[PDB]
Amino acid sequence: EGGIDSGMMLQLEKNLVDIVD
Amino acid sequence: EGGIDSGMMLQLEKNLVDIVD
Amino acid sequence: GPHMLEREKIYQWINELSSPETRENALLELSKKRESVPDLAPMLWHSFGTIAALLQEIVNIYPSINPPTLTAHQSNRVCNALALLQCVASHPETRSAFLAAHIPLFLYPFLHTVSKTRPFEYLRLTSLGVIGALVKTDEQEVINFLLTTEIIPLCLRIMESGSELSKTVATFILQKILLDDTGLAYICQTYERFSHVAMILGKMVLQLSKEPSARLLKHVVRCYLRLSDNPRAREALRQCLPDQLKDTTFAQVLKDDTTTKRWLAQLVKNLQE
Amino acid sequence: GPHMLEREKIYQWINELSSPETRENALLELSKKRESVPDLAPMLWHSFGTIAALLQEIVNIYPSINPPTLTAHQSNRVCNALALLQCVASHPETRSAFLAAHIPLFLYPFLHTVSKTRPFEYLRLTSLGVIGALVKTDEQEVINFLLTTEIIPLCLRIMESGSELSKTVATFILQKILLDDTGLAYICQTYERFSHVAMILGKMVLQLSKEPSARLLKHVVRCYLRLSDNPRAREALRQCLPDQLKDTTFAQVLKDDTTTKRWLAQLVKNLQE
Could you tell me where this protein is found in the cell (chains A, B) (predicted)? Predict the structure, then answer.
């Protein structure tokens, strides 16, 4: 595919949450 | 008297909580 | 067959970032090792042509940003390069050179986009992550550089009309700016600059009355508390503080997090004198 | 009678710090205005002899500290002087000169005291507050200075055998040192340094399982979390993390503070690889 899947999206969210909290 | 009364001890903790948290 | 050690393999991928025929796969592999390789950032920074290759990846998609035509595959690839820049933004050996080269500026066009398609949201969130990791280091020079740029109006636009997750990261960036003494004085130097922050913060509280977000409300309250350290801002907040932060609107939501309650309690106390 | 404005009243008291006959009362009046006068710190710093008079108050009780003969009256007076030094330590216009003059070092004898009497606890807590306010500014120059001094063993002593509130502020100071990149590498470059910190933190968890303290547990977990950003410390914490941090020992109290749960759960995930 080479697109954007739920795993990539969820991993980004966890990255952002760990940054701001 | 010029001592350390119970109010002053309480207000110091208030300062320290504001710093620490 | 030769079995390279892990350090040799990482350097191989780094070397493979130079050539466009191998760069996309190298970006993929290196981005996966971002957490496993603690010295990845100086390995990238001190490699000839490597940083220039990553910036070229960023700029390559500028024509797809306006008008908005960015594909999921283009966002995928460029966000791999962005993840490597976040690694360089947050490392003590490269952070300062990262600022000196003004690298955060290359992400700002991504923060101007408003398209709600998944390629743009993924790009916007990844870009906010780079800036967020940069200000998390609590370095004065980070805030000094950011104050020379348009970061504050960019964050405010996202805080008002972004996704809940984008809002939380934009508010965190504003929060770090305000926590710096220069940043607080900057935003409070003009009443119009302060008024823009307060109006947008006030509207976020109205939304938070409808969408209870604990993580967003925590950073909104923190921005209000730090604003209450500036006298000019402190007098205005006595009148323009939303009523939802004074009654028991968020009471049941805040019963789960005592850290935010103390902030909101210290905020209303700073508005009474 | 003439009604003197507030700025001239403040300057009158500041000038009265220069004479022994009037210094004590001026100390009292100025300390009561500490949070009302936003520019008190540069007013103090740029007044002739004023800082030297505040240091003389501190140094005047060095002979009363060892052996411990400090009276409540002496402690009250010097803590008013320390309260004024605290606002000099936290103001952006004066904090750098405060550091360059090495002022915080004058407080370290007070942190060596072990007397549990009220005059010594009040002095120790007040001194910890000056250092706490100084590190709360999230600046690198502060941590650089502290690393040329013995602040870390002093904090560790207090974390191990101080009062509950003293433990919290000393842990917060250590927390801010760990959050700085240099501080983290300083504590982690030698295994002896890291194990001393880990042993102290490990022992505090046990006491927290007996005498629960929500605020103290928060900063202990934060120190553990930040230590996990160092590779040598993460692999060691995989084996020496207290069992009370892995089961439901603190889950009963943590349900009232969501912030600390996000930290502890994030910490164990880093230890599971």
Answer: Cytoplasm, P-body
Q: Which of C19, C25, C121 is nearest to C80 (CA)?
A: C25
Q: Are C107 and C127 in contact (CB under 8 A)?
A: yes
Interchain proximity B9–D76, CB inside 8 Å: no
Q: From the CA of D91, how many Å to the nearest CA of chain A?
A: 26
Total structural domains within chain C? 1
Could you list the beta-strand ranges (E) of D136-272: none
Q: How was this structure determined?
A: X-ray
Answer left, alpha or beta for residue D149, where phi above 0 means left and psi between -120 and 50 means alpha.
Answer: beta
Using CA atoms, how far apart are residues C10 and C27, in angstroms rounded to an integer? 11
Contact between residue D271 and residue D237 where contact means Cβ atoms under 8 Å apart: yes
CA distance D65 to B1: 21
| Alpha carbon distances (Å) from D41 to D5, D44, D46, D93 | 19, 5, 9, 8
**Is B21 in the C-facing interface, judged by CB distances under 8 Å?**
yes
Spatial distance between the Cα atoms of C185 and C230, rounded to a whole number of angstroms: 8
Q: Which residue has the tokens 């120190």?
A: D223
Question: D151 is written with which tokens?
Answer: 């602040």
C120: which residues sit within 8 A by CB, 6+ positions away? C68, C70, C75, C113
D26 token code pair = 């001026």
3-class SS of residue C90: coil
Tokens of D135: 């590190």
DSSP letter string over D4-43? --HHHHHHHHHHHTTSHHHHHHHHHHHHHTTTT-TTHHHH
- DSSP class of residue D74 equals H
CB D229 within 8 A of CB D184: yes
- Chosen for mutation from C168, C216, C217 (greatest number of chain A CBs closer than 10 Å) is C168
Q: Which helix (H) or strand (E) holds D159?
A: helix D151-161
What CA–CA distance (Å, rounded) separates A6 from C22? Answer: 26
**Cβ–Cβ contacts within 10 Å for residue C37, how many?**
16
Q: Cα–Cα distance between C41 and C121 in angstroms, integer?
A: 26
Query: CA of A12 to nearest chain D CA: how many angstroms apart?
Result: 15
Please say whether the dihedral angle defined by the alpha carbons of residues C254, C256, C258 and C260, taken in this order, is positive or negative: negative
Q: Which residues of chain D lie closer than 8 angstroms to B19, CB-CB?
A: 129, 132-133, 136, 169, 172
Which distant-in-sequence residues (6+ apart) come within 8 Å of D117 by Cβ?
Answer: D68
Q: Counting every residue, how long is chain B?
A: 21
CATH of the domain at D205: 1.25.10.10
Is there contact between D and C if contact means ≥3 C-beta pairs under 8 Å?
yes
Contact status, residue D268 vs residue D261, Cβ threshold 8 Å? no
Amino acid residing at D246: K
Contact D44, D18 (CB under 8 A): no
Closest to C136 (Cα-Cα) out of C91, C184, C82, C188: C91
Is B8's Cβ below 8 Å from some Cβ in D?
yes
Q: Which domain holds residue D104?
A: 1-273
Closest CA to C213 of C178, C162, C179, C271: C162
